[PDB]
Each structure stands twice: as C-alpha cells, then as structure tokens.
Amino acid sequence: GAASTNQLQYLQKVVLKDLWKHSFSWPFQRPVDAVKLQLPDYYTIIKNPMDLNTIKKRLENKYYAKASECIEDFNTMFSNCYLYNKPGDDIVLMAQALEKLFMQKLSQMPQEE
Ligand SMILES: C=CCOC(=O)C1=C(C)Nc2c(c(=O)[nH]c(=O)n2CC)[C@@H]1c1ccc(C)cc1
C-alpha cells in the first residue's frame, strides 16, 4: 500500500534521529520505569507515558495515519516531564533543549498542501 505521508517520512528519517542524537536525550530514550528510577507517584500523575523508542517503533510500523498524531506524541513526552518535575530541575532544562530542537526541525518539515 501507499507509503506514509511525506511529513511522517520526515519525522521518522530526520526529526526522530536528531532528537535521539542530542546529548540530552538519554532520559527520554526508553519508557520510564518509575520504580527502578525512584520516581514516586509517576504513574498516578502521568497517564500517557511516552518516549522516543516508542515513537520510533510507531513510525516504523505505520501506527500513525498522519503527522499531527506523531507530533502530539513527541509533545506528550515533553509535557510529561514538565508536569511531573519542577521548574529549576535539571531534567526540565534537558526536555526544554530537546523541545527547542524539535521545534527547529518541525519548522524545516515540508509543508502540506
Ligand atoms: C535513579 C534514577 C536517576 O535519575 C535518572 O536517571 C532519571 C531518569 C532516567 N528519568 C527521569 C528522572 C527524573 O527525575 N524525572 C523524570 O521525569 N524522569 C523521566 C524522564 C531522573 C533524572 C534524569 C535527569 C536528571 C538531570 C535528573 C534526574
């Protein structure tokens, strides 16, 4: 069947790779194991966990019909961090740096019609 939209191809081939390679990506690479990571009440507060590997697998397996739902998963990743943690926390600065890069790469995505 038809390949994914040109925007989803960009998200997979350009955006995901660039965020993964950023030096601050390591907290965001894999699903949060809150017990192992000593994060109390994480699953009570964060009802929709999301991470880069999950997004990667979704892109590789045609989970998304269009780019907006993939963009929303990247945004849930960042928002989960902002909600659970506190202003001034180093992890928040890390998420903010990845999010700034994300916005930069989205601005270079091909335009829809
Ligand atoms: C025993 C665990 C050691 O801490 C880590 O390895 C962490 C991981 C993987 N992830 C999260 C942590 C957190 O405090 N809050 C979160 O939301 N996450 C999930 C994204 C902590 C952490 C990350 C980075 C900094 C600078 C500080 C703390």
- Resolution, Å (one decimal): 1.5
Q: What would the two tokens of residue 11 be?
A: 């998200």
Pocket test of ligand 1: the residue of 19, 36, 37, 46 to mutate, having most ligand atoms within 8 Å of its CB, is: 37
The approach used to solve this structure was X-ray
Q: What is the Cα–Cα distance from 68 to 113, expressed in whole angstroms?
A: 14
Please report whether residue 1 resides in a domain. Answer: no
**Structural domain count, the chain:** 1
Q: What is the Cα–Cα distance from 108 to 113, expressed in whole angstroms?
A: 15
**Where is the binding site, in residues?**
85
User: 16: domain CATH number?
Assistant: 1.20.920.10
List Cβ<8 Å contacts ≥24 apart for 73-82: 74/15, 74/19, 74/50, 74/102, 76/48, 76/50, 77/28, 77/50, 77/51, 77/52, 78/102, 80/32, 80/46, 80/48, 80/49, 80/50, 81/27, 81/28
- Expressed as residue numbers, the domain containing 61 is 6-108
Rounded to the nearest 10 degrees, the angle between the axes of helix 67-84 and helix 90-107 is: 160
Burial letters 18-39, b for 16+ CB under 10 A, else e: ebbebebbebbeeebebeeeee
Q: Give yes or no for residue 49 CB within 6 A of ligand 1.
A: no
Q: Give yes or no for residue 79 CB within 6 A of ligand 1.
A: no
